[PDB]
Ligand binder design. Sequence first.
Ligand SMILES: NC(=O)C1=CN([C@@H]2O[C@H](COP(=O)(O)OP(=O)(O)OC[C@H]3O[C@@H](n4cnc5c(N)ncnc54)[C@H](O)[C@@H]3O)[C@@H](O)[C@H]2O)C=CC1
Ligand SMILES: NC(=O)C1=CN([C@@H]2O[C@H](COP(=O)(O)OP(=O)(O)OC[C@H]3O[C@@H](n4cnc5c(N)ncnc54)[C@H](O)[C@@H]3O)[C@@H](O)[C@H]2O)C=CC1
Ligand SMILES: NC(=O)C1=CN([C@@H]2O[C@H](COP(=O)(O)OP(=O)(O)OC[C@H]3O[C@@H](n4cnc5c(N)ncnc54)[C@H](O)[C@@H]3O)[C@@H](O)[C@H]2O)C=CC1
Ligand SMILES: NC(=O)C1=CN([C@@H]2O[C@H](COP(=O)(O)OP(=O)(O)OC[C@H]3O[C@@H](n4cnc5c(N)ncnc54)[C@H](O)[C@@H]3O)[C@@H](O)[C@H]2O)C=CC1
Ligand SMILES: CCCCCCc1cc(=O)c(Oc2ccc(N)cc2C)cn1C
Ligand SMILES: CCCCCCc1cc(=O)c(Oc2ccc(N)cc2C)cn1C
Ligand SMILES: CCCCCCc1cc(=O)c(Oc2ccc(N)cc2C)cn1C
Ligand SMILES: CCCCCCc1cc(=O)c(Oc2ccc(N)cc2C)cn1C
Lengths: 257, 257, 257, 257
Amino acid sequence: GFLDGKRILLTGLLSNRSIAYGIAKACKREGAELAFTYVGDRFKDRITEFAAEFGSELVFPCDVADDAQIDALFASLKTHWDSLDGLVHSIGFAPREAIAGDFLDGLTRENFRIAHDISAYSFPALAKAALPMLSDDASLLTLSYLGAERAIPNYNTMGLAKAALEASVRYLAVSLGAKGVRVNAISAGPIKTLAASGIKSFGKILDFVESNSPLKRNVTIEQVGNAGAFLLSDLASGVTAEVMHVDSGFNAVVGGM
Amino acid sequence: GFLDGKRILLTGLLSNRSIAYGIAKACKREGAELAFTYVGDRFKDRITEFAAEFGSELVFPCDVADDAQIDALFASLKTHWDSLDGLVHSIGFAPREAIAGDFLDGLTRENFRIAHDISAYSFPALAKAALPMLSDDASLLTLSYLGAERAIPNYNTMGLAKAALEASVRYLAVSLGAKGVRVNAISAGPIKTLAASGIKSFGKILDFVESNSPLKRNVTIEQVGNAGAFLLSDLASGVTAEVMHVDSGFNAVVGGM
Amino acid sequence: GFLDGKRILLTGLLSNRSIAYGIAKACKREGAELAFTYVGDRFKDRITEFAAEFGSELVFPCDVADDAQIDALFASLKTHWDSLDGLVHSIGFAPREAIAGDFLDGLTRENFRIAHDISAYSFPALAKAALPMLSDDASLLTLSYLGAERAIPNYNTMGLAKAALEASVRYLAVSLGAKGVRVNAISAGPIKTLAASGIKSFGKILDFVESNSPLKRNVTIEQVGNAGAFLLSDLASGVTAEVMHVDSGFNAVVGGM
Amino acid sequence: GFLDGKRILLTGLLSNRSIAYGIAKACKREGAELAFTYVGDRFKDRITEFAAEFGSELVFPCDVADDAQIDALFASLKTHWDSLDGLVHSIGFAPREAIAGDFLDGLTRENFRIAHDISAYSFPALAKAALPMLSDDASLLTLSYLGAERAIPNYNTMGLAKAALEASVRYLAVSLGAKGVRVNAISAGPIKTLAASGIKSFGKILDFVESNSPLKRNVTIEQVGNAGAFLLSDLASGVTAEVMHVDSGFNAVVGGM
Ligand SMILES: NC(=O)C1=CN([C@@H]2O[C@H](COP(=O)(O)OP(=O)(O)OC[C@H]3O[C@@H](n4cnc5c(N)ncnc54)[C@H](O)[C@@H]3O)[C@@H](O)[C@H]2O)C=CC1
Ligand SMILES: NC(=O)C1=CN([C@@H]2O[C@H](COP(=O)(O)OP(=O)(O)OC[C@H]3O[C@@H](n4cnc5c(N)ncnc54)[C@H](O)[C@@H]3O)[C@@H](O)[C@H]2O)C=CC1
Ligand SMILES: NC(=O)C1=CN([C@@H]2O[C@H](COP(=O)(O)OP(=O)(O)OC[C@H]3O[C@@H](n4cnc5c(N)ncnc54)[C@H](O)[C@@H]3O)[C@@H](O)[C@H]2O)C=CC1
Ligand SMILES: NC(=O)C1=CN([C@@H]2O[C@H](COP(=O)(O)OP(=O)(O)OC[C@H]3O[C@@H](n4cnc5c(N)ncnc54)[C@H](O)[C@@H]3O)[C@@H](O)[C@H]2O)C=CC1
Ligand SMILES: CCCCCCc1cc(=O)c(Oc2ccc(N)cc2C)cn1C
Ligand SMILES: CCCCCCc1cc(=O)c(Oc2ccc(N)cc2C)cn1C
Ligand SMILES: CCCCCCc1cc(=O)c(Oc2ccc(N)cc2C)cn1C
Ligand SMILES: CCCCCCc1cc(=O)c(Oc2ccc(N)cc2C)cn1C
């Protein structure tokens, strides 16, 4: 497959509806060797089962709020792998009130801080901690959303954090590029599932994308997964600093009129 | 003038090379009534002199790192003005190492936090604290730089913060727009002066803009000031959520080839 | 006013709902001296009346499909004015079928050709013919629409032409900038009026902008006019190669969800 | 391979330095069945040899300036293939003077017309003529350049045409998307070769990209080819209306300062 022998660490695989799950499935299909992170001891068994499904026992805890755990992640990974060829950053969080209702109603210094700390800072932080062991042709991938580019109802403080994240893709690409490392994001369309506690229903958005996107359908984690696998691979060796929309073309229209 | 009777609060007027100084000069010319903020008691005399130059004694301290000072600013201003018609956010800061040399070399959680706290969060924070006294047709203005859009050497962590700031312009515009309030940014070109301690020399950038921008010259605080006065005025009543480049057209070219 | 003594030629003033009418009204208010073009002899009396309303008898015919009429326009204008300080290009046309229904249904080589010839080529063509008599600090302005940036239903072939027009703003800015001439566009929101023969009803779009734009209202020709007057003036001397949205912020959101 | 059984027509394969050659090589590797077009009878032997290299005798003449030849192309192809799964539009032309020196110096109505006719119109024209035989999940691909987005020296009239071409990607995506057809462009970086008669030397641009792009190297036709093969494939089924940069990240920086 087109990722034969590539060693790729994936963060954020929480369930089989996780974008990271779709990415892992495509990476494994194309020949990659995988490793996984998780946060919260109650998830250790679940992530270990997912890792085994993808032929791996390489599972490590990492809360990206914690500098020591970030450093420990790579020290642990290094005991198994001399080098890292891929990193998937599929980690996002904003406090419930900061992504519901009016933008200013949910805006506080602490909500702003946490959303940017977890959703934005953590990407180049992982990249920096990984750097000593990154292969010269490594590929780093994060996930964003159209709310970084244009104001979408409720996305609010997360839209600010994602804008900073997309900027970090560009600055990382310059920093790591002379070595040969590529850095990209996928701007994914919404993925249909029941909105978890802390996230407002986005059913209306899913209906609107299905009715108005060029392809008249929502994207799947399989579609986002395949695009991710492509970007992590040498097929994409000419591509860096890119925010690739995988969203059935929805970003490119003015729908609903 | 086109700002007759408009009451406008300006932050960030530090010296006569401050972008806020150019904005204040144009606003006063067009008939505005002004008020000013400062940070650091050693600057009280200087800002008071500037305020007097612009026909005002309305001077208030405000370190935007501090929630209590933000609230106190508007309580103080309110003892003078029933309503606020304009707000100029001309406040930026990133730690020295975070805007010099390699992006990852100067990246730390705390440097990231401070740059985003001061340069990004503080804009909608001021807007939210001001909201009860904002006139229905008020206009809020911030300042950004091309480094938010594309990777520019050394801008580094400030580029991430400015991307979040430009996103905040859009989310603020939605939040405040039904009331009638407009929210915009000027993406200013570099302003020629000796780079202060904490900021790397940008002489090469100034030379490059002078040699490669469409107008073959750097922008001035007078030019940025006039564009700012326009955006704060009813001349610009159709304009909101906009990031306006005032940069001699430099953003629109690929120069130096 | 801020355009005192500026000599500005306006094309495309067809009726009192024309964007050019709003621009002319604001330019005259701010002290400009105006001249006007028209196409079609049956409109000579009407444009002459409009010109008189704005204190001018300088009226010239010009079908921009015709090289000879373009050259003759400036030869005629030159008999009155030594130099030209402003040019307003408010000319658009696409064949009826090319802006109604499906994009490919209305696509023919000739429809493509005419839409690009009249709506795009004519802007730098006028600029080139004017160049010998342009003042060193002249300002050239055209009008575009969000359909150049994202696919909007029915805009179709006009969206392609407007994308080429916005690109021409950038290339013109480089070409004319060393002399000191500025070149900009306003991306105007829809203007409420009965859609003329050849243009599909855009009532649904007007309703959608009123319901979803940040300012929750459609823009007016007065608002577009004032932004245009600003860009034509020395207030905007730092601004070139810019496409300025004057659209109540609508471009910056994802509405209707 | 990931294009197993896909039937793909490629235009514009002129030499082994053609971007279409890199695309053909990657498509064949991944299992596609190919067909080819050419213009000019003196090239019949050369394109037939290239087709044979890629396991095909399906070669057809088509000057896209000519409506009858466009229709005849698909009638001919249809005698071999019931359906078409992919179309590669790798056709560009602008008259020599229109892409050398000053933008206005090389601007004429006819130069504008030809550049837009051949480089822009021809893409949706081919799509429309192909439509009856396009598979429901077909994928159409064109090639653009950063000069569509920002002013690059000499690109001039071609920059306008490419902006219209990128807009056509979006309008085509809406038109063909309900059927299930995807439409994308690759914005390719410059490809190192001796600039042919009619094209100015771009050596300085190649040096500048090598020195300033994030990856510090120019892109190759192999890299553009692999990205093209990806977009033509079901791996990219979530991607449409996209302009993907394959340019070593150069679009995302401000270089040379
Ligand atoms: N789900 C959707 O419609 C879309 C999601 N995205 C982005 O895709 C990425 C993945 O989201 P999903 O797969 O849909 O949801 P998810 O909930 O399955 O994944 C989010 C992950 O972030 C991890 N996380 C949160 N705080 C963490 C911390 N302090 N330390 C380490 N991990 C932490 C979670 O454990 C979880 O694994 C996120 O960045 C999200 O913003 C983007 C676009 C659309
Ligand atoms: N100077 C330039 O070339 C360009 C500057 N900008 C932006 O323009 C704005 C103004 O910059 P300048 O006028 O050039 O420099 P400046 O130094 O004169 O203004 C910066 C202001 O930020 C204030 N500030 C910093 N931390 C603060 C805090 N905790 N609380 C309250 N105020 C604080 C400073 O006191 C100072 O008044 C900034 O946002 C800057 O990023 C943008 C583009 C270009
Ligand atoms: N009306 C709207 O909602 C919006 C209009 N625009 C653009 O604003 C500009 C002005 O449009 P409107 O004022 O609304 O309509 P308008 O009909 O009043 O102006 C169009 C003008 O183009 C002129 N024109 C057409 N073919 C010409 C030729 N061969 N030679 C010389 N003039 C020719 C017409 O005579 C007319 O004066 C156009 O470029 C339009 O595309 C943009 C955005 C929104
Ligand atoms: N070569 C480069 O650095 C870059 C090229 N592009 C674009 O990539 C595409 C391919 O360019 P290249 O492979 O580099 O050059 P190329 O010369 O090998 O391909 C251009 C093709 O256009 C065809 N063509 C020109 N007029 C035609 C007509 N009337 N009918 C049918 N075909 C016609 C030519 O025969 C030739 O096959 C073009 O669209 C070009 O603008 C984009 C970016 C960078
Ligand atoms: C408000 C706009 C609707 C969002 C649609 C798409 C969308 C975009 C996202 O960024 C997202 O991810 C999260 C968002 C918030 C939190 N706390 C955690 C996560 C993982 C989920 N979804 C579904
Ligand atoms: C590194 C890229 C050069 C920047 C050119 C333009 C530029 C952009 C800016 O954002 C800027 O403002 C600051 C930046 C940092 C801090 N600590 C404080 C401030 C007020 C100054 N300048 C001059
Ligand atoms: C199809 C999308 C709706 C357009 C909304 C805004 C809009 C955008 C326009 O560009 C426009 O101008 C014309 C369009 C066509 C022709 N033949 C002539 C003209 C002058 C009018 N309007 C109203
Ligand atoms: C002027 C800017 C330099 C262009 C660099 C990249 C570039 C961009 C291109 O679009 C290009 O393609 C052509 C351009 C003109 C013609 N007549 C025919 C073709 C096929 C070649 N190259 C090399």
